[PDB]
Write an enzyme that holds these catalytic residues in place. Structure first.
Site, short mmCIF file in Angstrom:
data_model
loop_
_atom_site.label_atom_id
_atom_site.label_comp_id
_atom_site.label_asym_id
_atom_site.label_seq_id
_atom_site.Cartn_x
_atom_site.Cartn_y
_atom_site.Cartn_z
N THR A 1 -2.41 20.98 -7.63
CA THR A 1 -1.95 19.61 -7.44
C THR A 1 -3.25 18.38 -7.47
C1 LIG Z 1 -1.54 22.00 -6.85
C2 LIG Z 1 -0.35 22.58 -7.88
C3 LIG Z 1 -2.56 23.17 -6.62
O1 LIG Z 1 -1.97 24.36 -6.59
C4 LIG Z 1 -0.85 21.44 -5.46
O2 LIG Z 1 -1.79 21.64 -4.50
C5 LIG Z 1 0.51 22.07 -5.06
C6 LIG Z 1 1.11 21.51 -3.64
C7 LIG Z 1 2.27 21.51 -3.50
C8 LIG Z 1 3.23 22.25 -4.06
C9 LIG Z 1 4.46 22.53 -3.73
C10 LIG Z 1 5.21 21.54 -2.67
C11 LIG Z 1 3.89 20.73 -2.02
C12 LIG Z 1 2.66 20.70 -2.50
N1 LIG Z 1 0.38 23.40 -4.59
C13 LIG Z 1 1.07 24.58 -4.67
O3 LIG Z 1 1.77 24.48 -5.43
C14 LIG Z 1 0.70 25.81 -3.85
C15 LIG Z 1 -0.44 26.44 -4.18
C16 LIG Z 1 -1.11 27.34 -3.40
C17 LIG Z 1 -0.47 28.79 -4.03
C18 LIG Z 1 -0.57 29.69 -3.05
C19 LIG Z 1 -1.19 29.56 -1.68
O4 LIG Z 1 -1.43 30.67 -0.81
C20 LIG Z 1 -1.00 31.95 -1.46
C21 LIG Z 1 -1.75 28.35 -1.40
C22 LIG Z 1 -1.57 27.36 -2.26
N2 LIG Z 1 1.65 26.92 -4.22
C23 LIG Z 1 2.30 27.47 -3.45
O5 LIG Z 1 2.50 27.01 -2.35
C24 LIG Z 1 3.09 28.59 -3.76
C25 LIG Z 1 4.58 27.98 -3.97
N3 LIG Z 1 3.20 29.72 -2.98
C26 LIG Z 1 3.30 30.99 -3.34
O6 LIG Z 1 3.70 31.37 -4.49
C27 LIG Z 1 3.36 32.00 -2.44
C28 LIG Z 1 3.27 33.29 -2.71
C29 LIG Z 1 3.47 34.06 -1.80
C30 LIG Z 1 3.51 35.23 -1.38
C31 LIG Z 1 3.49 35.92 -0.25
C32 LIG Z 1 3.12 35.05 0.85
C33 LIG Z 1 2.94 33.61 0.46
C34 LIG Z 1 2.83 33.26 -0.57
C35 LIG Z 1 2.96 32.06 -1.27
C36 LIG Z 1 2.66 30.86 -0.26
#
Ligand SMILES: *[C@@](C)(CO)[C@](*)(O)[C@H](Cc1ccccc1)NC(=O)[C@H](Cc1ccc(OC)cc1)NC(=O)[C@H](C)NC(=O)C1=CC2=CCC=CC2=C1C
Ligand SMILES: [Mg+2]
Ligand SMILES: [Mg+2]
Lengths: 231, 195, 211, 235, 233, 244, 240, 222
Positions: free
Chosen positions: C1
C-alpha cells in the site's frame, strides 16, 4: 400455607406448593391442542390478545426441521425452554449427525425442569408445552408439565377449558389415529377438537394458529389467511 | 523515542526533549512533544518503546491529577517521583513490562527548591543536578561536568543546554529534529518557543 | 500500500491506492482502503487487511454509540484515541494496522495517525504503507495551506501515482476523498494505467518512460 | 421474609405484579402506529416550575429506525436503553443491516426476568418501542417487566392509560395519516394530564422511513397544539 | 503435543456391491521393535459398524473405551436401542471426527488415523476416514499410512469409481484386500503376517475373521540373486 | 433456605436511619470515656479504663490508647477486639503510603481510609458493623496538629476538643466551657483530667483506672514525639494537677 | 457472596428501601444551588450543634470532582464519599480515554447511574444521598446545574435545594427566582443564595457555606467575613 | 513437534453474472503426493440461495462451513425466518474468521448468490476475515494460474478495439451462464494440466432466482 414460601419445602402431606402454583399458571393460559396419526403430527393453538388494538400472542415455536412445540402459561419461560431444545436438537446434529429423538427431547426437558424444583433460590417454570415431531420411529406427541413430568400421548390439550377438547379426542381416538397420508383431515380433527373448548368467542383468521410435521413435511407454522381454509 | 535531557539550576529545572518520531525508514513527525504536565509545578519527559511511552505517561498523569483533586493539594516532586518509580519497578516483573525511561522535573513550593529525578524502565531512581537517558549522556555529560554550577541562572542553564544540543547535533548519527525546551520554576511550567 | 492525507484551508484530502498482495502475487487489483465511519469521519487502511477492516468497523460501532448517548457527533481526537486504546489491548499479539483518522469537527478539520503500537499523532500531513516515501516527496515540495480544492485533489492523486509507479506493492487504482464541514465527498476511482499516460502527456513528467 | 422469584397461589410472580403497580403511578406515554409512520408522545410532569423541563428525557432514540418512550421508574430504563442501543448497533456490525423492531424488542425483554437471589428485582418501567423495517413495516411494541411484549396499532401506558386506551379504541383506524395521529396523541394527552397541556410539559416524536426517528421541537409542537384547539372549536 | 510410542500400521478398506470390507494387522510396534504380536485394531460397534484404527495404541485404547461407553449411553432410556434408534456408522464417525478436531484445536491430538466402515439403516454403504488433524474424506477405497501408498493403487484397479461398486462382488473384494495385505507384508517394515478382517454386509450382517495369515508368498527367486552387482558366487 | 435466619444488617428504617449503626452507637455509649484536646503546641489523649481489678497487670496492659505510626495515635471506645482489627489495617495503610510516596501519611488520608472501611460494612456484605469509635490524634506538615473522630457509620469530623464513649454529653459541655484557642499542652492535660474526674461513674479517679498520652513538638527541634504515659507517670501528673 | 435482595417492590408498587433512603436525605443538612447568567453558586448549611469543631480539617460540604465541576450533597456523609470518589475516578478516566473533560450532564448521568445500580443489585442498600452537581462544560459559558437522588433519576434545574427544610427554601426560590432575568452578576447570585438559606439556617455566622463556580475552571469558596457582609446587608434592608 | 495444519489442495472459482452466479471447485482431496479421494465435494448449498466453499485445510474448511450453516439456522430462529442476504452473510463470516485471528482457519473462502436487487454476487475472503465483493475470483492451489485468464476473458483487460491504436478499450459486457460455464471448464482443464493437486472432477453450482443447480464434469485423473 406455611410450606409454599419456596420450592425447597415439602408440605406435611408431601406436596410441593410452588410447583402446584406454577401448574396453576398453565390453567390460566389460552387453550392449545395436540394430536397425531401414524404419518403426521399436528398442533392447534388458540392465540390470545390484550385488546382490539393489540396483536394475538404467538403460541407455537419451531425447534428444528422435524420438531416443535406449543405453549400455555408464561411465554418467556417457553422461550427459555424452547431455546434449550433448539440447542439440544442442534448439538445432536453437529456432533452425531443425528436428528434428536422426540422421546429423548422430553427426557431432557424433564431433567431441566426438575433442577429448578429441588434447589433454593430458583423457581419452577410457569409453562406447559406440547411437543410434536417426526423421527426414526414415526410421529410423536409429548405433553410437558413444569413439575418435570413428560408424557407421550396420541392426543391431548392444555390451558383454560382444555378438558372439553381432551374428552373429544378421547372419543375420536380410533378415528384420527387412522388418518394417514392426509394432512388436511388431521388438522380438521384438531380444529374440531379445540372448538370444544371455546365459549363466547369463535375461531377467526388472526385468532387461530396451526402447525404440522410429518413423513415428508418439515415443521411449518400456519397463521393469518393460511388458516382461513380451516375456519 | 530518542533524546531527553534535564538540568537543575539555582531556581528552576529545564527539560529538553527531541521532536522526531520515526516509523520504519520515514520520519512521520518533527514537532512531537515528549512530555506531560503531572501537576502545575511538576513536569515529566519520557522516552522508550513506541506506544508504551505515551500510555505510561498519561496513566501517571491521570493518577497524580486524581490525587490532586482528592486532597486539594499538590504532591511534592519527590513524592511523585517515588510513585513513578514504584509503578516501573512493579512493571519490570510483569508479563509485558512498560519500556519507558523518564525524567521528572519539579519545583518544590514547600522547600523553594528545584528538583530533577532520573528514572529508567527498571525503576532505578536517582536525584541529579543534570541527567539524560539512552546515548544522550555519552555526548553531553562531559560538557555538563565541566560547565555546571549550582548557582547558575535560568539563562545560563539555557546557554549550557544549547551547547549540549550542538554537540549532539555534531556527533550523533541520528537526526532528532531539534528539541522542545520547557522550564519549571516557582511560577509554574512554560515553554521556550524559540530554540 | 500507499495512503496519504493532509489538512488544508478547505478541509482534508485523503487518497489511497487499491492493490492487495500475497507475496509477489497481486491478489486484488481493486480493494477499498477507506472506511466511511460516519458522514464526517474517514479511516485509511495499511497493513493486514483483516485487522484494518475489523478494528475500524468496530471503531464505527463505538463512534455510533457515542452519538446515541451524548446526542452529539464524536470528535476526531476522541475517535482516534478509542482506536489507539483498542490496539494497546492487543499490544505485542501481532496486529498489523496503520491508519489515518480524517474528519471535520468543532475544532475544524482533524487528522490523526494511529498504528498497531498504540501510537497516536496529530498532524497536517501523513502517508502510510510500503510506498509512503515516494508520496512524501511529491507532497512536501507542492504542499501549501493556501491550496484550492481542485489543486489539492490533484496533489493527493498525483502523490499516489508517484508511489504506484515506483513501489511494486502499490498500484491498481486511486480513490480520492475530500472532507468538508458538510461532510466527506468521494471523488472517484481512477485507474493508474490510464491516469499514468494522461498525467505523462499533460504534465510532461515521467520523461524517462516511453509512451 | 419470602423469595423474590415466588409464585402466588393464582400462578403469578409477586414481584412482577408489584412492578406493574409502579408503572401505573408513572407519567402517561402514548404510541400510535400508521402506514405513514409511528407517533410517540409523553407527559413530562415536572415536579416544580424551577425544573428546566427540556432536560426531562422520556422519549429516546435507540437507532435511526427505532425510537422508545417510557413510563414508571424511569431510572431503571437507562440500562435497558443502553442494552437496546448496543444490541441494535452490534447486529449492524455482525450482519451489515438494520435490526428488526421485533428482534430488538425481544432482546430487551430477555433482560426482564433475569432477576433472583443477575439483578435483585424486576424493572419498574414499561417501554413503548416504535420503529420501521423492510419486512413488517411500521411497528409499535409494548415491553413489560414480565418479559412479555405485545404489538399494538395504538397503546397508552402510565397513570391515564385505561382512560386513554378506551379513547384510542374509538379513534384508531387503518387509514390514519401522520398529521391526524399527531393531533390524536396531543388530544388524548391533554385529556388525561393533570396540568394544562402545552409545548413545555408535553413532548412529541415520530419515526418515518425517510427521515428516521425525530424528537419534535417545542416550536413545532406548539403549532400542532394551536392547530388542535382550532379544530376542536370548529364544531 | 506428544509423540507416538507404541504404534499400529496400515488399515485398509473398500466398498463392494452389498457392503464394505476392512482389515488391519495385529501388531503393536515400539519403534523398530516388533513388541506386541496380539493387538486387535479392528473394533466392532454393534452389528453394523467396524472402526479400524492406526497410530498410537494408548490413544486407540482410549477411543475403544469412548465407543464402548457410547453404546452404553445410547441404550439409556431408549426402547429402540436394538432397532430404529441403534447406533449408525454415520453417528459413530461424526462423534469421533468431532473429538479428533477438538483435540487438535487444543494442541493435544489423538495420534491416530481412523477408518469407520459400516452399513446404514437404508442399506447404504458407509466408508469414511478421519485423522489426528480432524481431516475427513470418503472414497470407494480408503487406507492409512503405508496402505495409502501401496494398497489403494491395487484396490482402485477393482473399484476405480462409484459406478464400479455394484459390479464388485464380496469374493472379488475380499481377494483384493487379502492380496493387498500380502503386499504390505512384503514391503512394510512395521507390519506382521497375522491380521484381522471384517465384512459388513447388508444381507449377511457382520462377519469378523480373526487369526488370518498371509499365505501363497513368493520367495524362491531369492536363491538366484547374488551380490550387489559384479559378484557371481 | 438460609434467608429465614438473616437479620439484614444493612437496611434503612422507615425514618431513614441505619438500625445496626444506631445500636452500635448505643453499645459505644457504655464504653469508657475517651477525651482528645488539641493545643497550639501539641495534642492530649486521655481515656478511662473500665472497672478494673487489683489483680490486673496494668503496666503491660493496653485497651484504650494505640500507636498507628510515629506521628499518629488513636483512643478507642467500644469493642477492643473490633478496634484491633481496624488498627492493624490502619498501620498497614500508613506503611503502604510510606512505601509508595516515601513520605509519612497525612492524618486525614489515614482517617478517611478507616472511615471508608466502616462505611462499607453499613452498605454491603450483610455483616455487622464494627462497634468502635476512634479519636485520632496526629501531626503532619500540611495542617499541623489534628484531632479527628470516626464512628460505626463511617462518618468522620475534625475537632479542637472532643470526647467519645460514656457521658459525652456532659463531657462536651465541660470542654466547651473551659477550652480556649490560645491554650497550651500543659493546660490541655489539666483540662482533660479535670473533665474525666467530673464525668467518671467511679467514686474517684486514680492512676490505675487511666490511660494517657501526648503528642508534642516538645521534641529536640523541628520534630514530633509520642509519649504513652506509664502507670507511675500518670500517678505523678494526677498529683501535679491536684486531683489526688 | 452476600446476594440478598434488599431493595424490592411492595404490593402497592413501592420500593421502600429507596423511599427510606430519601428520608435520610430529608434528615441531612440543607444544600442549595442557584445558577446566574454567567455563574453558579452552591450554598450549604452547617448545623451549629457541633462547636469545638476544627473547620480547617473538617470535610467541606462542597467537593471538586474536576477543575471545572463541583458536587454538594444532603444525606449520609459516609455514603457521599463513595459517590464522590467514583465520580472523581470516572472524571480522570474520561479525560484519559476520550481526551476531553466530562460534561456536567455526563458526570451527573454517571453518578445517577451508580445510585440506580444500588437499587437493583443484590446484597447492597441504596445510597442515602441526593446530590447537586454544578459547573461549566469545556469551552462553554452556559451555566449547568443538576440534581440526583437515591432512585437514580436526575434532571437540570434553574435553581434547586435539597435536605432538611428544603420545602421552605424551594418555596422562597420559586417566588424570588425569575427565569426571564436570572441573577446577572455574581453578587446578585450569592445574595439570592444567602437570602434563601436565611429562611432556614438560624444564625448567619458559621452556619452558611458559599462556593462560587465561574466559567473556565474558576472556582472559589467565600470566607466567613465575606458571607457575613451579605448577612448584614440583607437584614438592614429587611428592617423597613 | 505437532503441526495442527495441513494442505488438502484443491482449487475454487466464483464468477458473478448479471442475474446469476457460479461457484465451482474440483473434487480432488490430497495430502503431499497421495490422493485421498477423487470425489470429495467442496462447494456446498448453505441455504437462503447462498453457496460456499472453503479451500485450503479441509478440516478448517469443513468446520467453517458447518458453523456458517449453523449461523444461517440461528438467523432464522432469532429474526422471524428472515432471508439472510448475501451481504449480511459475508459480514457474518468475517466475524467467524476473526474469532480465530490468533489460530486461523487456514482457508480461502468464497461465497456466491444474488444481491437484494437480484443481480449476481460473489464475495471473497482471506483466512483471517478480510472480505470484498468481486465479479471474478479464483482461490486455492491454482489461483495464480486462473485469475489472469479471467482478467483477460471476463473483464477484457489489455484488450482493445482494433483500429483504435490502443486508445479505445473493449467495452465491458456481462456474460451468459452458458458463456461463463465455458470459461470455468476451460480454466479447470488448463489448471489440471499444469498443477498436480488439481484434477479428477469438477463440480459447479449455479445460483439463479429459481434456486441452486448442480453440474458435474470429469477431469484428468493423473
Ligand atoms: C500494501 C499493498 C502493502 O502490502 C497495503 O498495505 C495493503 C493494505 C490493505 C490491503 C487490503 C485491504 C486493506 C488494506 N496490504 C495488503 O494487501 C496486505 C499486506 C499484508 C500481507 C500479508 C500480511 O501478513 C501475512 C500482512 C500484510 N495483504 C493482506 O492482508 C493479504 C490479503 N493477506 C494474506 O494474503 C494473508 C495470507 C494469509 C495466510 C495465513 C494467515 C494470514 C494470511 C494473510 C493475512
Ligand atoms: Mg537511571
Ligand atoms: Mg497421479
Amino acid at each position: 400455607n406455611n410450606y409454599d414460601g419456596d420450592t425447597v419445602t415439602f408440605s406435611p402431606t408431601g406436596r410441593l406448593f410452588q410447583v402446584e402454583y406454577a401448574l396453576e399458571a398453565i390453567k390460566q393460559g389460552s387453550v392449545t391442542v395436540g394430536l397425531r396419526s401414524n404419518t403426521h403430527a399436528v398442533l392447534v393453538a388458540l392465540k390470545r390478545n390484550a385488546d382490539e388494538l393489540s396483536s394475538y400472542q404467538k403460541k407455537i415455536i419451531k425447534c428444528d426441521e422435524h420438531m416443535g412445540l406449543s405453549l400455555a402459561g408464561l411465554a418467556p419461560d417457553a422461550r427459555v425452554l424452547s431455546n434449550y431444545l433448539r440447542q439440544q436438537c442442534n448439538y445432536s446434529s453437529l456432533v452425531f449427525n443425528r436428528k434428536l429423538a422426540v422421546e429423548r427431547a422430553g427426557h431432557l426437558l424433564c431433567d431441566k425442569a426438575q433442577k429448578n424444583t429441588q434447589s433454593y433460590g430458583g423457581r419452577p417454570y410457569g409453562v406447559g408445552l406440547l411437543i410434536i415431531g417426526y423421527d426414526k420411529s414415526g410421529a410423536h406427541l409429548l405433553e410437558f408439565q413444569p413439575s418435570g413430568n413428560v408424557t407421550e400421548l396420541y392426543g391431548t390439550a392444555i390451558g383454560a377449558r382444555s378438558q372439553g377438547a381432551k374428552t373429544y379426542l378421547e372419543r375420536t381416538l380410533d378415528t384420527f389415529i387412522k388418518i394417514d397420508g392426509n394432512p388436511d383431515e388431521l388438522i380438521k380433527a384438531g380444529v374440531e377438537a379445540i372448538s370444544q373448548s371455546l365459549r363466547d368467542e369463535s375461531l377467526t383468521v388472526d385468532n387461530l394458529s396451526i402447525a404440522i410435521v410429518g413423513k415428508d413435511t418439515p415443521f411449518t407454522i400456519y397463521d393469518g389467511e393460511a388458516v382461513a381454509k380451516y375456519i | 523515542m530518542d533524546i531527553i535531557l534535564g538540568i537543575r539550576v539555582q531556581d528552576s529545572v529545564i527539560l529538553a526533549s527531541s521532536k522526531a518520531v520515526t516509523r520504519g525508514i520515514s520520519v512521520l513527525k518533527d514537532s512531537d512533544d515528549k512530555t506531560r504536565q503531572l501537576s502545575p509545578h511538576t513536569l515529566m519527559s519520557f522516552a522508550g518503546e513506541a506506544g508504551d511511552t505515551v500510555q505510561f505517561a498519561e496513566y501517571i498523569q491521570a493518577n497524580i491529577q486524581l490525587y490532586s483533586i482528592r486532597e486539594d493539594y499538590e504532591l511534592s516532586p519527590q513524592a511523585v517521583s517515588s510513585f513513578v518509580r514504584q509503578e516501573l519497578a512493579k512493571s519490570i516483573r510483569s508479563r509485558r513490562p512498560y519500556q519507558v525511561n523518564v525524567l521528572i522535573g519539579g519545583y518544590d513550593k514547600k522547600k523553594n527548591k528545584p528538583e530533577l529525578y532520573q528514572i529508567d524502565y527498571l525503576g532505578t531512581k536517582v536525584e541529579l543536578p543534570y541527567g539524560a537517558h539512552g546515548y544522550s549522556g555519552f555526548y553531553t555529560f562531559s560538557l555538563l561536568d565541566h560547565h555546571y554550577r549550582p548557582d547558575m541562572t535560568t539563562e545560563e542553564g539555557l546557554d549550557l543546554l544549547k551547547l549540549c544540543v550542538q554537540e549532539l547535533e555534531k556527533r550523533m548519527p541520528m537526526d532528532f529534529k531539534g528539541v522542545i525546551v520547557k522550564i519549571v520554576d516557582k511560577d509554574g511550567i512554560r515553554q521556550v518557543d524559540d530554540f | 500500500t500507499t495512503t496519504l492525507a493532509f489538512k488544508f484551508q478547505h478541509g482534508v484530502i485523503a487518497a489511497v491506492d487499491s492493490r492487495a498482495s500475497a507475496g509477489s502475487y497481486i491478489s486484488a487489483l481493486r480493494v477499498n482502503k477507506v472506511i466511511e465511519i460516519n458522514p464526517y469521519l474517514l479511516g485509511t487502511m495499511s497493513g493486514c487487511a483483516a485487522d484494518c477492516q475489523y478494528w475500524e468497523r468496530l471503531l464505527a460501532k463505538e463512534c455510533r454509540l457515542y452519538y446515541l448517548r451524548n446526542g452529539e457527533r464524536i470528535s476526531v481526537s476522541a475517535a482516534s484515541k478509542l482506536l489507539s486504546n483498542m490496539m494497546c489491548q492487543y499490544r505485542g499479539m501481532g496486529l498489523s494496522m496503520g491508519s489515518m483518522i480524517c474528519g471535520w469537527d468543532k475544532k475544524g478539520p482533524g487528522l490523526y495517525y494511529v498504528d498497531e503500537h498504540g501510537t497516536r499523532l496529530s498532524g497536517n500531513m501523513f502517508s502510510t504503507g510500503s510506498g509512503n516515501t515516494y508520496a512524501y516527496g511529491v507532497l512536501d515540495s507542492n504542499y501549501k495551506w493556501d491550496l484550492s480544492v481542485e489543486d489539492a485533489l490533484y496533489l493527493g492523486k498525483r502523490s499516489i501515482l508517484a508511489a504506484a509507479h515506483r513501489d511494486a506493492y502499490s498500484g491498481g487504482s486511486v480513490n480520492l476523498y475530500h472532507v468538508t464541514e458538510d461532510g466527506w465527498i468521494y471523488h472517484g476511482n481512477h485507474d493508474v494505467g490510464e491516469l499514468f499516460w494522461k498525467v505523462k502527456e499533460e504534465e510532461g513528467s515521467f520523461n524517462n518512460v516511453i509512451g | 421474609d419470602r423469595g423474590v422469584s415466588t409464585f402466588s397461589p393464582e400462578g403469578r410472580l409477586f414481584q412482577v405484579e408489584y412492578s406493574l403497580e409502579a408503572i401505573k403511578l408513572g407519567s402517561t406515554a402514548i404510541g400510535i402506529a400508521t402506514k405513514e409512520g409511528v407517533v410517540l408522545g409523553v407527559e413530562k410532569r415536572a415536579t416544580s416550575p424551577l425544573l428546566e423541563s427540556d432536560s426531562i428525557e422520556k422519549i429516546v432514540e435507540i437507532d435511526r429506525h427505532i425510537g422508545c418512550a417510557m413510563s414508571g421508574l424511569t431510572a431503571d430504563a437507562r440500562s435497558m436503553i443502553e442494552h437496546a442501543r448496543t444490541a441494535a448497533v452490534t447486529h449492524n456490525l455482525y450482519y451489515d443491516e438494520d435490526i428488526n423492531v421485533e428482534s430488538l424488542t425481544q432482546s430487551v425483554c430477555d433482560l426482564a426476568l433475569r432477576f433472583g437471589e443477575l439483578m435483585s428485582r424486576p424493572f419498574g418501567v414499561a417501554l413503548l418501542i416504535a420503529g420501521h423495517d423492510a419486512d413488517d413495516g411500521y411497528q409499535l411494541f409494548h415491553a413489560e417487566p414480565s418479559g412479555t411484549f405485545y404489538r399494538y396499532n395504538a397503546k397508552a401506558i402510565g397513570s391515564g392509560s385505561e382512560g386513554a386506551q378506551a379513547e384510542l379504541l374509538n379513534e384508531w383506524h387503518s387509514s390514519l395519516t401522520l398529521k391526524e395521529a399527531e393531533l390524536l396523541v396531543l388530544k388524548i394527552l391533554k385529556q388525561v394530564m393533570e396540568e394544562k397541556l402545552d409545548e413545555n410539559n408535553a413532548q412529541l416524536s415520530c419515526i418515518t422511513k425517510q427521515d428516521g426517528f425525530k424528537i419534535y421541537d417545542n416550536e413545532k409542537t406548539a403549532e400542532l397544539i394551536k392547530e388542535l384547539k382550532e379544530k376542536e372549536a370548529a364544531e | 503435543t506428544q509423540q507416538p510410542i507404541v504404534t499400529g500400521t496400515s488399515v485398509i478398506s473398500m466398498k463392494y456391491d452389498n457392503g464394505v470390507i476392512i482389515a488391519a494387522d495385529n501388531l503393536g510396534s515400539y519403534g523398530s521393535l516388533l513388541r506386541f504380536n496380539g493387538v486387535e485394531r479392528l473394533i466392532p460397534v454393534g452389528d453394523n459398524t467396524v472402526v479400524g484404527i492406526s497410530g498410537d495404541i494408548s490413544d486407540m485404547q482410549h477411543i475403544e473405551r469412548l465407543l464402548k461407553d457410547l453404546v452404553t449411553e445410547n441404550a439409556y432410556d431408549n426402547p429402540l436401542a436394538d432397532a430404529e434408534e441403534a447406533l449408525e456408522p454415520s453417528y459413530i464417525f461424526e462423534y469421533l471426527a468431532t473429538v479428533m478436531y477438538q483435540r487438535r484445536s487444543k494442541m493435544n491430538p489423538l495420534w491416530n488415523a481412523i477408518i469407520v466402515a459400516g452399513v446404514q439403516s437404508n442399506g447404504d454403504q458407509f466408508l469414511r476416514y478421519v485423522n489426528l488433524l480432524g481431516v475427513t474424506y470418503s472414497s470407494p477405497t480408503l487406507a492409512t499410512g503405508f496402505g495409502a501408498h501401496m494398497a489403494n493403487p491395487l484396490l482402485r484397479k477393482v473399484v476405480d469409481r462409484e459406478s464400479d461398486i455394484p459390479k464388485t462382488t464380496v469374493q472379488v473384494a475380499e481377494e483384493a484386500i487379502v492380496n493387498a495385505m500380502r503386499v504390505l507384508y512384503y514391503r512394510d517394515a512395521r507390519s506382521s503376517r497375522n491380521f484381522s478382517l471384517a465384512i459388513i454386509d447388508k444381507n449377511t450382517g457382520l462377519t469378523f475373521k480373526k487369526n488370518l495369515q498371509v499365505e501363497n508368498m513368493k520367495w524362491d527367486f531369492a536363491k538366484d540373486i547374488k551380490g550387489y552387482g559384479t559378484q557371481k558366487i | 433456605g438460609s434467608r429465614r435466619y438473616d437479620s439484614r444488617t444493612t437496611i434503612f428504617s422507615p425514618e431513614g436511619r441505619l438500625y445496626q449503626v444506631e445500636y452500635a452507637l448505643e453499645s459505644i455509649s457504655h464504653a469508657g470515656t475517651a477525651i482528645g484536646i488539641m493545643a497550639s503546641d501539641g495534642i492530649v489523649l486521655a481515656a478511662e479504663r473500665k472497672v478494673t481489678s487489683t489483680l490486673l497487670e496494668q503496666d503491660t496492659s493496653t485497651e484504650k490508647l494505640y500507636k498507628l505510626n510515629d506521628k499518629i495515635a488513636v483512643a478507642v471506645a467500644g469493642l477492643t477486639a473490633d478496634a484491633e482489627i481496624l488498627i492493624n489495617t490502619a498501620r498497614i495503610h500508613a506503611q503502604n503510603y510510606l512505601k509508595t510516596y516515601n513520605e509519612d501519611i497525612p492524618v486525614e488520608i489515614l482517617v478517611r481510609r478507616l472511615s471508608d472501611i466502616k462505611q462499607g460494612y453499613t452498605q454491603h456484605g450483610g455483616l455487622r458493623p464494627f462497634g468502635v469509635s476512634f479519636i485520632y490524634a496526629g501531626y503532619d506538615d500540611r495542617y499541623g496538629y489534628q484531632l479527628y473522630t470516626s464512628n460505626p457509620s463511617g462518618n468522620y469530623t475534625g475537632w479542637k476538643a472532643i470526647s467519645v464513649g460514656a457521658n459525652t454529653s456532659a463531657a462536651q459541655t465541660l470542654l466547651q466551657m473551659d477550652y480556649k484557642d490560645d491554650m497550651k499542652v500543659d493546660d490541655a492535660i489539666e483540662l482533660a483530667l479535670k473533665t474525666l474526674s467530673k464525668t467518671t461513674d467511679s467514686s474517684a479517679l486514680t492512676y490505675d483506672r487511666l490511660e494517657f498520652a501526648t503528642i508534642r513538638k516538645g521534641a529536640n527541634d523541628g520534630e514530633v514525639y509520642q509519649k504513652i504515659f506509664k502507670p507511675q507517670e500518670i500517678k505523678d501528673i494526677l498529683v501535679k494537677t491536684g486531683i489526688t | 457472596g452476600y446476594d440478598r435482595a434488599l431493595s424490592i417492590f411492595s404490593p402497592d408498587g413501592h420500593i421502600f428501601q429507596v423511599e427510606y433512603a430519601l428520608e435520610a436525605v430529608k434528615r441531612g443538612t440543607c444544600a442549595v444551588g442557584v445558577k446566574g447568567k454567567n455563574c453558579v453558586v452552591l450554598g450549604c448549611e452547617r448545623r451549629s450543634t457541633l462547636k469545638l469543631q476544627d473547620t480547617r480539617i473538617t470535610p467541606s460540604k462542597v467537593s471538586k470532582i474536576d477543575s471545572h465541576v463541583v458536587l454538594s450533597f444532603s444525606g449520609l456523609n459516609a455514603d457521599s464519599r463513595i459517590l464522590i470518589e467514583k465520580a472523581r475516578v470516572e472524571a480522570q478516566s474520561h479525560r484519559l480515554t476520550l481526551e476531553d473533560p466530562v460534561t456536567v450532564e455526563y458526570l451527573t448521568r454517571y453518578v445517577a447511574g451508580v445510585q440506580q445500580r444500588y437499587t437493583q443489585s443484590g446484597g447492597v442498600r441504596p445510597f442515602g444521598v441526593s446530590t447537586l452537581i454544578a459547573g461549566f462544560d469545556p469551552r462553554d459559558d452556559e451555566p449547568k446545574l443538576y440534581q440526583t437522588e437515591p432512585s437514580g433519576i436526575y434532571s437540570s434545574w434553574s435553581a434547586q435545594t435539597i435536605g432538611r427544610n428544603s420545602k421552605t427554601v424551594r418555596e422562597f426560590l420559586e417566588k424570588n427566582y425569575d427565569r426571564k432575568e436570572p441573577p446577572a452578576t455574581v453578587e446578585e447570585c450569592v445574595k439570592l443564595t444567602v437570602r434563601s438559606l436565611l429562611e432556614v439556617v438560624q444564625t448567619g455566622a458559621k452556619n452558611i457555606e458559599i462556593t462560587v463556580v465561574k466559567p473556565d475552571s474558576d472556582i472559589v469558596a467565600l470566607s466567613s467575613e465575606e458571607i457575613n457582609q451579605y448577612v448584614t446587608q440583607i437584614e438592614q434592608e429587611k428592617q423597613e | 513437534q505437532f503441526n495442527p495444519y495441513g494442505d488438502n489442495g484443491g482449487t475454487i472459482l466464483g464468477i458473478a453474472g448479471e442475474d446469476f452466479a457460479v461457484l465451482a471447485g474440483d473434487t480432488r482431496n490430497i495430502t503431499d503426493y497421495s490422493i485421498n479421494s477423487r470425489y470429495e465435494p467442496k462447494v456446498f448449498d448453505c441455504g437462503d440461495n447462498i453457496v460456499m466453499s472453503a479451500n485450503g485445510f479441509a478440516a478448517d474448511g469443513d468446520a467453517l462451513v458447518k458453523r456458517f450453516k449453523n449461523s444461517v439456522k440461528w438467523y432464522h430462529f432469532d429474526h422471524n425466518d428472515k432471508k439472510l442476504s448475501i451481504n449480511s452473510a459475508a459480514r457474518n463470516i468475517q466475524h467467524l474468521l476473526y474469532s480465530r485471528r490468533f489460530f486461523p482457519y487456514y482457508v480461502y473462502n468464497i461465497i456466491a448468490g444474488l444481491d437484494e436487487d437480484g443481480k449476481g454476487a460473489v464475495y471473497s475472503f482471506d483466512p483471517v476475515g478480510s472480505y470484498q465483493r468481486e465479479q471474478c475470483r479464483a482461490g486455492g492451489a491454482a489461483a495464480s494460474l486462473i485469475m489472469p485468464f479471467l482478467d483477460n476473458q471476463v473483464n477484457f483487460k489489455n484488450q482493445y478495439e482494433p483500429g483504435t491504436n490502443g486508445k479505445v478499450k473493449k467495452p465491458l459486457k456481462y456474460l451468459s451462464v452458458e458463456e461463463v460455464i465455458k470459461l470455468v471448464r476451460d480454466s479447470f482443464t488448463s489448471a489440471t494440466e499444469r498443477h498436480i493437486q488439481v484434477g479428477d472432477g469438477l463440480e459447479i453450482l449455479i445460483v439463479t432466482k429459481d434456486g441452486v443447480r448442480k453440474e458435474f464434469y470429469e477431469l484428468k485423473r493423473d
